[PDB]
Design an enzyme around this catalytic site. Structure first.
Site, short mmCIF file in Angstrom:
data_model
loop_
_atom_site.label_atom_id
_atom_site.label_comp_id
_atom_site.label_asym_id
_atom_site.label_seq_id
_atom_site.Cartn_x
_atom_site.Cartn_y
_atom_site.Cartn_z
CD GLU A 17 -35.19 -12.80 32.34
OE1 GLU A 17 -35.04 -11.54 32.32
OE2 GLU A 17 -34.83 -13.54 31.40
CB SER A 39 -40.04 -3.38 23.84
OG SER A 39 -38.81 -4.08 23.89
CG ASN A 45 -39.89 -7.54 25.03
OD1 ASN A 45 -40.37 -6.43 24.88
ND2 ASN A 45 -38.76 -7.89 24.42
#
Ligand code: CL
Ligand code: NA
Length: 129
Positions: free
Chosen positions: A35, A50, A59
């Protein structure tokens, strides 16, 4: 802050992620690697407007307020900037909510595509935990 693997593994364990909702520590470490590359400052904009924030790319569509994501929720009840701190407490606390949302760690598509089904023990091998 860019964490080392074992440094992050230790911090995540201290904050209660090892075996949280049944996901061993290596799962969490693997997720963070793919990530954010272990960088607390990581941010990435999504196609829908977003943004994903921090070590676990949480998020703004659902979990935090960044002031620019219309018609979104703030379920962790935090500013998204809190998720960028050197201190991972906020990210961990929010991640605990996310992983309870029904999909488990599949909420992180990078976990599903890169970590799920792997020998995740590899991520904490050698670490003094
Ligand atoms: Cl699950
Ligand atoms: Na939001």
């Amino acid at each position: 802050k860019v964490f080392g693997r074992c440094e992050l593994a230790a911090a995540m364990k201290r904050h209660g992620l090892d075996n949280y909702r049944g996901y061993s520590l290596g799962n969490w470490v693997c997720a963070a690697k793919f990530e954010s590359n272990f960088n607390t400052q990581a941010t990435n904009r999504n196609t829908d407007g977003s943004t994903d924030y921090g070590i676990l790319q949480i998020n703004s569509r659902w979990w935090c307020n960044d002031g620019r994501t219309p018609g979104s929720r703030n379920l962790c009840n935090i500013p998204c900037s809190a998720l960028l701190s050197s201190d991972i407490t906020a990210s961990v606390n929010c991640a605990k909510k996310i992983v309870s949302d029904g999909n488990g760690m599949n909420a992180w598509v990078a976990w599903r595509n890169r970590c799920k089904g792997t020998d995740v023990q590899a991520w904490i091998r050698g670490c003094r935990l």
